[PDB]
Each structure stands twice: as structure tokens, then as C-alpha cells.
Design a protein around this nucleic acid. Structure first.
Ligand SMILES: [Zn+2]
Lengths: 357, 67
DNA sequence: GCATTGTTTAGATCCCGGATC
DNA sequence: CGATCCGGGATCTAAACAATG
């Protein structure tokens, strides 16, 4: 049915090859010139985003590169009772932690360190002349350094802090993937470190910006690349799952819609994370490979719409890793945009999503 | 039914007009002789059969969207 | 159902970027 | 390092399919 729509979404093999070539050439040199005893000496590369998760659509012009810092012995103080934003404190005084120059009092400067980070990058992108490079202005709020290579190929770089300590109290009931995947897998997955990225946008007065956001992008990559209740789902032609195909078309649905409303109107200001988080809860309640048969492509899609419709209809989508945190909270999005969104899809669903062609 | 390629359009008449004159009951031998004969015709002797096969798929490809 | 020739596709091989240790 | 091996766009090889007693 809609199986042909995927052909209009497959990335050209030569496009990804040339794009990732120039992206890697800038990233490695930027990473090489980084880590010169600015306490960045142990920065590592973490590949996340819709590309490395094999769900990138249209043309490969955007990348999500993450830089990590293995900063040890960090004590985190929960900001208010948000359950997601955190103060970075330090557990003990003696060791002289590498980011101590970025310590304000007992809290870490999410602004001074991030500006220093952009400073080192802006200094060295000019020096290299192998590739035309323009640094996009830091977008109001945006914690990322958006580089623009010649002729698109934008690169989003988010400085992150790696924490090998155990996860937090907020994530205690999250990641409810026990019938799906394994309870053994959850333990194996929880031991992996959690990451800290500066808060993306203004909230509250706009000050006290030293809050940090939890990030489990590496977690989302692992379970996507090993997604089957049986270990060999997608290993062989038999029992190929449609999981990736569902939120692929879902991302194309919303991507298609945002472009459609180019009037600077509503249905704006929410990204694929809501689609990905919704598809995540879909696979939770559907923890069997039989439910995700390839033949029932329109059925599993319809079930994923149904849960997204219901997530819209219920006006609550909690973060997968953080249950209390609601991505469809009344503060985040007005109920009218859900009315806006549900109006479209229901029309598009019965009338076979006419925006595809 | 997939349209008749130029060989089948040419093979339907020749097998008949051979099995009448020939006394071979088996079609295995007769088909071997037809492939022998088709492999020995000039390209001009085979062009109208290509034109016919093109007209066959002309009203089977744009009237039946299945292949 | 045998044996031919041409067309069409799907079942399979190849090839490369990413990734983990 | 790099050695290896997997996932998926690209491309090939193969068998099945047509008329016929
Ligand atoms: Zn699968």
C-alpha cells in the first residue's frame, strides 16, 4: 500500500557517502584541536540522531553530533521538583575536578563552559580552509553549535557531560521495557552512563540557567538497533519487523505537515521527539514480534497512529525515561494544538494522508 | 498472462505447420527444431515479430497495471 | 507435460560506512 | 590503531512465465 512511499524517502548512497565525508573531516579536526587541557582533554564522540538510528529521511543534510565529558564524582541536586532539570554539584572537595574553573560556587557553569566551548570551535573553523564553513548564530535558547558547511550539511554539536554513576530517582519507574526486550536488558542498559546537556530553551524567569537536562540519546540508539523481542528480529528476511518503518512514515507525516504550515502559525514548536517517544510507548504495549509482522504494515502503522491519536486524545505523553515528565503537559502545549493536530491526522488517516504525494 | 514475446508469436504458427508435415509426436524434439530455426533467421526476418510483441504489451501494460 | 527464446522480477551477492573492543 | 562484521542502498543472477499438444 504505502510501501511505495518509502522509495521517496531512501537516502542516496552517494549522498550519505559524500555528506558524512565532509562532516567527519570537520568533526575529527575540530575534535582533534579540542581537548588541549581546557579540561576538555577527555572529550569523546557520541553519534546520535535520526541518522545513526537509521531513520533519517529525505536528504542527509543534518547531523546530530554529541561531545561528551567524562567528569567524575558529580553530585546532582534536583531543580525544584521538575524531575528532569538538575544542578551539577560536586561530591567532594579534594580531587580538583577538571571543570573546577567552570565552578561558580558549588554549581557548574553551564553557560561559561558552553561559551568557552563555542569559542574554541569558532577560533579553529576559520583556520581550516579545506572546506567552506560558516558558524550559524546561536539560536535563542539553543545549547548547540550549529555549523553549516558549504551547501547545507548542517552539523548540530551538543556539549554533554558523561556520568558513569547510577541513574536517578526520576528514572526509577521509566524505561518500562521488561516484557519487551528483557528485564535482563534493562539492567544491562541502566548500568550504561547517562548524559547531561544544557537546557534547550527558556523556562521561568530565564535566569538560574545552570540547570542541566538528562539525555539518553545513546539509549534510544541501542534499543532501536536491537529492537526485537526475539534477538534475531530483522536478522533474516523471515520475520522482518516494520518497527522502523512506522515512525519513519510518522516523521515524514509531521515533517510534511510543518512545511505545509509555513505561515509561521501553529502546529509548530514540537519536534520528532514526540513522535519517537510515542512510537516508544507503542512498542511497549506491543511487546511481541507477531504484532509487528511486515505484511501488516498498514495495520501496525494504524496501531501506532491509534496510540498517537490516543496520546493526543488523552493529551499526555510522558518521557520514556522520565515518567513524571509530560511532553504533552498543558504548560508545554495548549490543548488546541492537540485539537489542531488530531483534526489533521484523522482527516489524513481516513483519506490516506494526501500530503505524501 | 504476460504478453507474447517475439519468439512465442513466431513459435505458435511454426510448431503447428511443422507438426502437420513432420511425424514427431513429441513436442520436445519439435521445440528444439524451432529454436534451431529462430536462431538462424535474419534480423530483418525477425523485426516485424518484435513490432508485434510491442503492440501486444501496448494494450496489456497500459490496460492492466500488474506485472 | 516435455523442449525451445525472450522478458521480468525476486532472491541473492556485493559493497561501504559505522562501531565496538 | 584496525580488524571484523553488520545493516542497508545498489546491483546481479537466477528461475519462473508466456503459447502448445
Ligand atoms: Zn526488526
Amino acid at each position: 500500500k504505502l510501501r511505495a512511499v518509502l522509495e521517496k524517502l531512501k537516502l542516496s548512497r552517494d549522498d550519505i557517502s559524500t555528506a558524512a565525508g565532509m562532516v567527519k573531516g570537520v568533526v575529527d579536526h575540530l575534535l582533534l584541536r579540542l581537548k588541549c587541557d581546557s579540561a576538555f582533554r577527555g572529550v569523546g564522540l557520541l553519534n546520535t540522531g535520526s541518522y545513526y538510528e537509521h531513520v533519517k529521511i529525505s536528504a542527509p543534510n543534518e547531523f546530530d553530533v554529541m561531545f561528551k565529558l567524562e567528569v567524575p564524582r558529580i553530585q546532582l541536586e534536583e531543580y525544584s521538583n521538575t524531575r528532569a532539570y538538575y544542578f551539577v554539584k560536586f561530591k567532594r572537595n579534594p580531587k580538583e575536578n577538571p571543570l573546577s574553573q567552570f565552578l561558580e560556587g558549588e554549581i557548574l557553569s553551564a553557560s561559561k563552559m558552553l561559551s568557552k566551548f563555542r569559542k574554541i570551535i569558532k577560533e579553529e573553523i576559520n583556520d581550516i580552509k579545506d572546506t567552506d564553513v560558516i558558524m550559524k548564530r546561536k539560536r535563542g535558547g539553543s545549547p548547540a553549535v550549529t555549523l553549516l558547511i558549504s551547501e547545507k550539511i548542517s552539523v548540530d554539536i551538543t556539549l554533554a557531560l558523561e556520568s558513569k554513576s547510577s541513574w536517578p530517582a526520576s528514572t526509577q519507574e521509566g524505561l518500562r521495557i521488561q516484557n519487551w526486550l528483557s528485564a535482563k536488558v534493562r539492567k544491562q542498559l541502566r548500568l550504561k552512563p547517562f548524559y547531561l546537556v544544557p537546557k534547550h530553551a527558556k523556562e521561568g524567569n530565564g535566569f538560574q540557567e545552570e540547570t542541566w537536562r538528562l539525555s539518553f540519546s545513546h539509549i534510544e540508539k541501542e534499543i532501536l538497533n536491537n529492537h526485537g523481542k526475539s534477538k534475531t528480529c530483522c536478522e533474516n528476511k523471515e520475520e522482518k519487523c516494520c518497527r522502523k518503518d512506522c515512525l519513519k512514515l510518522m516523521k515524514y507525516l509531521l515533517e510534511q505537515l510543518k512545511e505545509r504550515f509555513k505561515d509561521k502559525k501553529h502546529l509548530d514548536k514540537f519536534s520528532s521527539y514526540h513522535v519517537k517517544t510515542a512510537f516508544f510507548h507503542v512498542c511497549t504495549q506491543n511487546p511481541q514480534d507477531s504484532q509487528w509482522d511486515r505484511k501488516d504494515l498498514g495495520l501496525c502503522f494504524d496501531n501506532c497512529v491509534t496510540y498517537f491519536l490516543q496520546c493526543l486524545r488523552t493529551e499526555k505523553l510522558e518521557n520514556y525515561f522520565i515518567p513524571e515528565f509530560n511532553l504533552f503537559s498543558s504548560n508545554l502545549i495548549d490543548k488546541r494544538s492537540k485539537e489542531f493536530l488530531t483534526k489533521q491526522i484523522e482527516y489524513e488517516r481516513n483519506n490516506e494522508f494526501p500530503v505524501f504525494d | 498472462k504476460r504478453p507474447m514475446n517475439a519468439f512465442i508469436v513466431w513459435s505458435r504458427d511454426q510448431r503447428r505447420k511443422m507438426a502437420l508435415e513432420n511425424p514427431r509426436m513429441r513436442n520436445s524434439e519439435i521445440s528444439k527444431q524451432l529454436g534451431y530455426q529462430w536462431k538462424m533467421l535474419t534480423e530483418a526476418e525477425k523485426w516485424p515479430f518484435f513490432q508485434e510483441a510491442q503492440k501486444l504489451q501496448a494494450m496489456h501494460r497500459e490496460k492492466y497495471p500488474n506485472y
